Design a binder for this molecule. Sequence first.
Ligand code: CDP
Ligand code: MG
Ligand code: MG
Ligand code: MG
Ligand code: MG
Length: 192
Amino acid sequence: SFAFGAVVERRDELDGRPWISYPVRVVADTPELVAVHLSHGTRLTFGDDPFSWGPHPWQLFGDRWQSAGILQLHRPGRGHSVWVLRDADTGAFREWYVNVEAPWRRTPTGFSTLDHEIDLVVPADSRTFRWKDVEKFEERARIGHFSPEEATAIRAEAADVAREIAAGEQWWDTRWSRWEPPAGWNALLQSF
Ligand SMILES: Nc1ccn([C@@H]2O[C@H](COP(=O)(O)OP(=O)(O)O)[C@@H](O)[C@H]2O)c(=O)n1
Ligand SMILES: [Mg+2]
Ligand SMILES: [Mg+2]
Ligand SMILES: [Mg+2]
Ligand SMILES: [Mg+2]
């Protein structure tokens, strides 16, 4: 288990290799929570083409994290994480972003996952949320980016969190939306 402020890899692994990989700072690493911090300016490392799913979509923006920094929150065993998203101009908390993805696994350099296209967008202090990229996911399932078993399990995952949020029973502490990084927790440029 990793120390507070340790710099580790967070990777989306596709085709047996890193589709994207970037350095993050550990905020928590416990049996109930893995939280990590992706800082504004951090270098994003993309694997070389071709991938079965095309270039990672974040190459549109280039090879740094352009927005405000984010906290990723992840409950071990579960098929998503929750991102704390802030306004890049004002720094104000805008929303919870639920990224549906493979349950994270620990690697010798940090953690590995894979985005599973389905996303939930939750306004501050709200049980109403917006489904994002559902139809995009279903098309990608149709053409075989995910097998039927995987697609079944992604939809179940996503429906699970959607119900908890709408019930007002979000697994995570909502005080994370006001958490502030220590000073000097700035851009990280290393590549794994
Ligand atoms: N290199 C990057 C890529 C994405 N991002 C952030 O991620 C957001 C979404 O990028 P995206 O290609 O995933 O878009 P959608 O999944 O919202 O369609 C951007 O609007 C930025 O806020 C970034 O800050 N720096
Ligand atoms: Mg996206
Ligand atoms: Mg996603
Ligand atoms: Mg998506
Ligand atoms: Mg999109």
